[PDB]
Paper text:
Rspo (R-spondin, also roof plate-specific spondin) proteins are evolutionarily conserved from fish to humans and have well-documented roles in a broad range of developmental and physiological processes resulting from enhancement of canonical and non-canonical Wnt signalling. ZNRF3/RNF43 specifically targets these Wnt receptors for ubiquitination and turnover, hence reducing Wnt signalling responses. Direct extracellular interaction with Rspo proteins inhibits ZNRF3/RNF43 activity. Here we report a molecular level analysis of the ZNRF3/RNF43 ectodomain structure and its interactions with Rspo proteins.
By using a combination of heavy atom and molecular-replacement-based phasing strategies, we determined multiple crystal structures for Xenopus (x) Rspo2Fu1–Fu2 (highest resolution 2.2 Å), xZNRF3ecto, zebrafish (z) ZNRF3ecto and mouse (m) ZNRF3ecto, (highest resolutions 2.4, 1.6 and 2.0 Å, respectively), plus complexes comprising xZNRF3ecto–xRspo2Fu1–Fu2, mZNRF3ecto–mRspo2Fu1–Fu2, mZNRF3ecto–xRspo2Fu1–Fu2 and xRNF4F3ecto–xRspo2Fu1–Fu2 (at 2.1, 2.8, 2.4 and 2.7 Å, respectively). The ZNRF3ecto crystal structures revealed a distinctive variant of the protease-associated domain topology. Two β-sheets (comprising β2, β1, β7, β3 and β4, β5, β6 strands, respectively) splay apart, accommodating an α-helix (αC) at the open edge; two additional α-helices (αA and αB) pack against the β4, β5 and β6 face of this distorted β-sandwich. A disulphide bridge, conserved across species, links two structurally elaborate loops, β3–β4 and β4–αA. The resultant single-domain structure is relatively compact. The crystal structures for apo xZNRF3ecto, zZNRF3ecto and mZNRF3ecto showed no major differences in the main chain conformation. Comparisons of ZNRF3ecto structures for proteins crystallized in several different crystal lattices, or for crystals containing multiple copies in the asymmetric unit, consistently highlighted an acidic region (N105-E114; residue numbering is for mouse sequences unless otherwise stated) within the β3–β4 loop, the short αC–β7 loop and the extended β1–β2 hairpin as flexible elements of the fold. Our crystallographic data provided independent structures for multiple copies of the ZNRF3 ectodomain in eight different crystal forms. All but two of these crystal structures reveal an extensive interface (average interface area 992±109 Å2) formed between two ZNRF3ecto polypeptide chains. The interaction is twofold symmetric; strands β3 and β7 of the ‘subunits’ abut face-to-face at the core of the dimer.
Author numbering: 31 to 82, 91 to 181
The structure:
């Protein structure tokens, strides 16, 4: 059930030195996807792109439905990311609890990549890194 996510942020200096920062956070593998390990560069998926290269980890921050005018269901968003070559997708479900119920419905034919959700302090930590818009990678593991 539990998904352990390691996030690494890369920052380069003009002189060519680089720094990294790694932190850990926890989520859950949803039944909509696989419970396997995955790792890749983080790409945030915003609404316009969802409604319009490979191995990236997609991050989707769900908003309240009234503020998240969408073309897709939460499942449909996961499917689209996997279609477009994501190795995994992580939903921040902080502002939309119901998405958890939708992702956990027993699928006859679940996605073959992990579909993880985070919330609370773990989601805050993730989004604080994602919003910096630098190079960052996520590793997802089940223990």
């Amino acid at each position: 059930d539990t998904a352990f996510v390691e996030v690494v942020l890369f920052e380069s200096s003009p002189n060519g030195d680089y720094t990294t920062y790694t932190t850990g956070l926890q989520g859950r593998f949803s039944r909509a996807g696989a419970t396997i390990s995955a790792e890749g560069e983080i790409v945030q998926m915003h609404p316009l792109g969802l409604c319009n290269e490979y191995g990236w980890v997609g991050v989707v921050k769900l908003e309240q439905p009234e503020l998240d005018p969408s073309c897709l269901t939460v499942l449909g968003k996961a499917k689209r990311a996997v279609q477009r070559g994501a190795t995994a997708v992580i939903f921040d479900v902080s502002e939309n609890p119901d998405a958890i119920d939708q992702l956990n419905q027993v699928s006859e034919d679940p996605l073959k990549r992990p579909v993880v959700y985070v919330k609370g302090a773990d989601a805050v930590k993730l989004m604080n890194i994602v919003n910096k818009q630098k190079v960052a990678r996520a590793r997802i593991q089940h223990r």
